[PDB]
Amino acid sequence: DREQLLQRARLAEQAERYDDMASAMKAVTELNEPLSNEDRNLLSVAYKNVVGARRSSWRVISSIEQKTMADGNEKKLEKVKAYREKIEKELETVCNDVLSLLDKFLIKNCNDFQYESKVFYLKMKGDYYRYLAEVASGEKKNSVVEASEAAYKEAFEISKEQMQPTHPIRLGLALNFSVFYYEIQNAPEQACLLAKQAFDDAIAELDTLNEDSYKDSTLIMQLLRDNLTLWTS
């Protein structure tokens, strides 16, 4: 039941039980009916927290594994490698769960006219392919890097066709799309340019800020700016 599963997600959020939240929203999604704005954000929050935990754990154990390599301790490096790999498989599973929800239900069921939804979901596809790309190697890395770029690119073209430059969703897509260029592609100029253009297009059109989203728009403009100052310096 949809009310039941959604109630559960709201309570699980308050309680910071994010696996419980993600499982409830996966189920809501599997009903094959559209998600409202509220619902969409519930799904996004649940999974951002589930994968973020894994990403944080992955980075910490990767730092240990690098130090154990240089220390030259082969017996412990065996054990740190294995644990980092246990975490990776966890991380990859969350990302592919999300990416299957997107591919099988959410993007699939979008009208040629539900542009806000499509952008939101293709951004999401870019994000989780990007999280896969943070830990991937070789040919598997190539594939998920291309997958990430292709979803970000489609999302961003629709958003320029159908959304005002101050729209929070278009702005946060620009933000994550620039981050992808900077840290996944090691392409700092391409990252800076896309970030700068977004900030610039928003400012040209402050007249398009709405009552219900001006605060989020301005927050994200400042995050774009923050990144450009770090990156240019």
Partner: peptide, 4 residues
Amino acid sequence: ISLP
């Protein structure tokens, strides 16, 4: 910093 990606979107919170």
